[PDB]
Amino acid sequence: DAQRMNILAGRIIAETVRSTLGPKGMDKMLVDDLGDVVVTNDGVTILREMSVEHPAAKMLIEVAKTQEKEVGDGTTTAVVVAGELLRKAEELLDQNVHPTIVVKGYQAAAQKAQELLKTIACEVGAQDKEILTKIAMTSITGKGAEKAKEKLAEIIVEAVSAVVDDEGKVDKDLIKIEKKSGASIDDTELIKGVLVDKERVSAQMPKKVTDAKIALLNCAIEMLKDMVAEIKASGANVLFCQKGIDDLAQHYLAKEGIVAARRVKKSDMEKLAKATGANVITNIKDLSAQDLGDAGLVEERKISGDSMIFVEECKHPKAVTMLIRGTTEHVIEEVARAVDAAVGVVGCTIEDGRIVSGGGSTEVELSMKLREYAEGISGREQLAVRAFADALEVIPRTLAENAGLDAIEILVKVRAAHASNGNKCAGLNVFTGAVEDMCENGVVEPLRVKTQAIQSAAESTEMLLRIDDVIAAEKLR
């Protein structure tokens, strides 16, 4: 009774982002209380912006937060599978199956799914840039752009492959994301170093400094003669002032051949302190030759529509930065979420070396094998394993729904292609309407995406099914 409304609340959250799955997915319209409009195909964006107050709905959201924290992609996939599991479980409750039996079936079916996924996955090499590019292609194109990814995917593959340490681990904090308005999306490029979105405050100043000694000054300049003497004595050639710089000081800086920029953002003072290794000085007497950062090259090179300072050839950091360019602000914010997703799947591929074919092909193969495993189960426990397998068909059907095809006959032909030692990679290519080999089409995604999503969907539904009543408590906590 009161238990069912929890199942209802969970399915409501699922069907909210249901139609946003896959490249041909539908866009949702987000409207706040102030009348601002947001249109997006990304599932996790919709999940965080929703006005979610129901507890069972929040218990489901923690799957997407967990799925994105541990993988970065598949949050839409995990939520939809959880919703379909709740629907199939409600059907079994309507057949007088006790909830604990459904949980025992789901729990046993989730473990068997993990073992089967470990055998379906194909092994790849952490140096195969082609397979890594196909992984990024599949992960980004689910949002809604074609062939522009081919340039961005190779940029992301080169960025991640550079920050891979000698242990095969990928630290996403080593790849800084930088967002700036520009002329077009294609202007997005990768830079071996760090970026400063400023220009020389005086054109007479020298524009390039090699073997730079970076100085981070947090005090305004606008007494002053002794300040210039102390800074010049520290043996520095590059100065970054967070506040302003005196116009008379900008002259003596240009005469001494010293590049300097004022109005430097607080974020640039933080990244220079973290990367190059400088302190944020609070008193000019503290500035020394050791607080300076080291950099092989500091060059301000213009770009399409803007001029900014590039700090390249820094051997000490071993890190890179993504310069994201775009026309509008919402386009840039959409491109940023595409990079965060591709970084996750490429990172998971290098760490795990296990991938499966996408397009719902792996789901169908897993569904068929689980129905075989269900046959051998005695006791009511079997019916839950059946539903768990038939629940996985929600992923290929939703893809066919959003592709405009008849999900019934599409799901039929794919099941036929997998039947009796078929092609475990046969799926629906939403661009052609035919059933093809997803591996030959370059549609692949990491194994951790599927394993983490399925386990996350199972554990949440198991948690909801153990709830049979909600009780009005007082105070607590």
Q: In the window 121-140, what residues touch ligand ADP (CB under 6 A)? A: 138
Q: Is 380 in the site for a copy of itself (CB under 8 A)?
A: yes
Give the pairing of strands 293-303 and 208-217.
antiparallel
- Residues within window 11-40 making contact with ligand ADP, judged by CB under 6 A: 20-23, 25
Q: Is the sign of the CA dihedral 319, 444, 333, 452 positive or negative?
A: negative
Three-state secondary-structure class, residue 277: helix
Residue 459 CB coordination number (10 Å): 16
The stretch among 71-79, 205-213, 222-230, 375-383 that binds ligand ADP (CB under 6 A) is: 71-79
Distances (CA, A) of 278 to 295, 320, 386: 12, 18, 61
- Binding-site partner at residue 474 among Mg ion, ligand ADP, a copy of itself, none, CB < 5 to 8 Å by type: a copy of itself
Whichever of 119 and 404 has its CB closer to a copy of itself, that residue is 404
Whichever of 206 and 442 has its CB closer to ligand ADP, that residue is 442
Query: 221 with 244: CB under 8 angstroms?
Result: yes
- Residues within window 77-96 making contact with ligand ADP, judged by CB under 6 A: 77
Non-local CB neighbours of 206 within 8 Å, separated by 6+ positions:
257, 258, 259
Q: Is 226 in the site for a copy of itself (CB under 8 A)?
A: no
Phi and psi dihedrals of 418, rounded to 5? -90, -15
Beta bridge partners of 455: none
- Binding-site partner at residue 343 among ligand ADP, Mg ion, a copy of itself, none, CB < 5 to 8 Å by type: none
Phi and psi dihedrals of 123, rounded to 5? -90, 135
Whichever of 443 and 464 has its CB closer to ligand ADP, that residue is 443
User: What is the per-residue binding string for a copy of itself in 228-267, x denoting contact by CB under 8 A?
Assistant: ----------------------------------------
Closest CA to 116 of 345, 424, 457: 424
Q: Is 36 in the site for a copy of itself (CB under 8 A)?
A: yes
- Whole-angstrom distance, CA of residue 373 vs CA of residue 149: 40
**Segments of 306-349 assigned E as strands:** 306-312, 320-326
Distances (CA, A) of 68 to 74, 177, 181, 469: 8, 17, 27, 30
Q: How far is the CB of 85 from ligand ADP (least distance, A)?
A: 16
- Whole-angstrom distance, CA of residue 383 vs CA of residue 386: 5
Q: How far is the CB of 439 from ligand ADP (least distance, A)?
A: 11
Q: How far is the CB of 27 from Mg ion (least distance, A)?
A: 13
Provide the token pair at 56.
């069972």
Whichever of 224 and 470 has its CB closer to a copy of itself, that residue is 470
Of the CA atoms within 13 Å of residue 46, those in its CB half-sphere come to 23
- Whole-angstrom distance, CA of residue 39 vs CA of residue 27: 6
Instruction: Choose which of 5, 233, 248, 470 interacts with a copy of itself (CB under 8 A).
Output: 470
- Residues of the shown chain interacting with Mg ion in the complex, contacts defined by CB under 5 A: 73, 76, 142, 341
Q: How far is the CB of 445 from ligand ADP (least distance, A)?
A: 6
Instruction: Choose which of 1, 51, 167, 226 interacts with a copy of itself (CB under 8 A).
Output: 51
- Residues within window 390-409 making contact with ligand ADP, judged by CB under 6 A: 395, 399
For residue 144, the 8-state DSSP code is S
Instruction: Choose which of 203, 223, 229, 408 interacts with a copy of itself (CB under 8 A).
Output: 408
Q: How far is the CB of 389 from a copy of itself (least distance, A)?
A: 12
Instruction: Choose which of 171, 189, 256, 468 interacts with a copy of itself (CB under 8 A).
Output: 468
Non-local CB neighbours of 203 within 8 Å, separated by 6+ positions:
none
Phi and psi dihedrals of 372, rounded to 5? -65, -45
Q: How far is the CB of 76 from Mg ion (least distance, A)?
A: 4
- Residues within window 349-378 making contact with a copy of itself, judged by CB under 8 A: 368, 372, 375-378
- Whole-angstrom distance, CA of residue 405 vs CA of residue 430: 9
Whichever of 71 and 261 has its CB closer to ligand ADP, that residue is 71
The stretch among 129-137, 165-173, 341-349, 461-469 that binds a copy of itself (CB under 8 A) is: 461-469
Q: Is 50 in the site for a copy of itself (CB under 8 A)?
A: yes
Q: Is 451 in the site for ligand ADP (CB under 6 A)?
A: no
Q: Is the sign of the CA dihedral 182, 185, 187, 191 positive or negative?
A: positive
- Residues within window 80-109 making contact with a copy of itself, judged by CB under 8 A: 95-101, 104
Q: Is 31 in the site for a copy of itself (CB under 8 A)?
A: yes
Q: Is 1 in the site for a copy of itself (CB under 8 A)?
A: no
Q: How far is the CB of 452 from a copy of itself (least distance, A)?
A: 17
Q: How far is C-alpha 250 from the geometric centre of its chain's CA atoms?
A: 43
Closest CA to 454 of 157, 106, 146, 125: 106
Whichever of 6 and 76 has its CB closer to Mg ion, that residue is 76
First to last CA, the chain: 27
- Interface residues with ligand ADP (CB under 6 A) are 20-23, 25, 43, 73-77, 138, 141-143, 358-360, 395, 399, 427-430, 441, 443, 445
